[PDB]
């Protein structure tokens, strides 16, 4: 319950520092958490669809790879 708060302020700060952000405001963390939740939902919907199409109960890495490829985020290193 309310697991969206798991991405705390230091995590968002580190993710911004990795992208080259020098100064961070206060209302940035909430919008970042919302966008991350939206993206996670959009990916997990397709992942669950791919898993249910295979009549399986365990979401494997191949389903996530296919869901990310069918959207536009090609990810490598998870096909073995």
């Amino acid at each position: 319950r309310d697991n969206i708060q798991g991405i705390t302020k230091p995590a968002i700060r580190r993710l911004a520092r990795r992208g080259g952000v020098k100064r961070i405001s206060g209302l940035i963390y909430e919008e970042t958490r919302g966008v991350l939740k939206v993206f996670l939902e959009n990916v997990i919907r397709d992942a669950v669809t791919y898993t249910e199409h295979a009549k399986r109960k365990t979401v494997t890495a191949m389903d996530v790879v296919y869901a990310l490829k069918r959207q536009g985020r090609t990810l490598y290193g998870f096909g073995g």
Binding site: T49, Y50, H53, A54, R70
Partner: protein, 90 residues
């Protein structure tokens, strides 16, 4: 050269008995139908190849529609496809 102009005109007459369609609009509708056909066929082929299946049934098309169409459009398309399959099987 085959085209779905006759079926598009029939659908238009079904939804609007007193409304025509231009040639450019007909070509745009044909291109849209072709794009949707290609997208759904590619998604179904990918779903069949991921499951080591050489047969594409109604389940693959339903999964492709649920993955491509968003929300209410996907639900309505799935309902229409199930109704058509039930009417054709009976």
């Amino acid at each position: 050269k085959e085209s779905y102009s006759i079926y598009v005109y029939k659908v238009l007459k079904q939804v609007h008995p007193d409304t025509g369609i231009s040639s450019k609009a007909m070509g745009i509708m044909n291109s849209f139908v072709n794009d949707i056909f290609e997208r759904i066929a590619g998604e179904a082929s990918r779903l069949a190849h991921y499951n080591k299946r050489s047969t594409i049934t109604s389940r693959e098309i339903q999964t492709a529609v649920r993955l491509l169409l968003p929300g209410e459009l996907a639900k309505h398309a799935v309902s229409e496809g199930t109704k058509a399959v039930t009417k054709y099987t009976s």
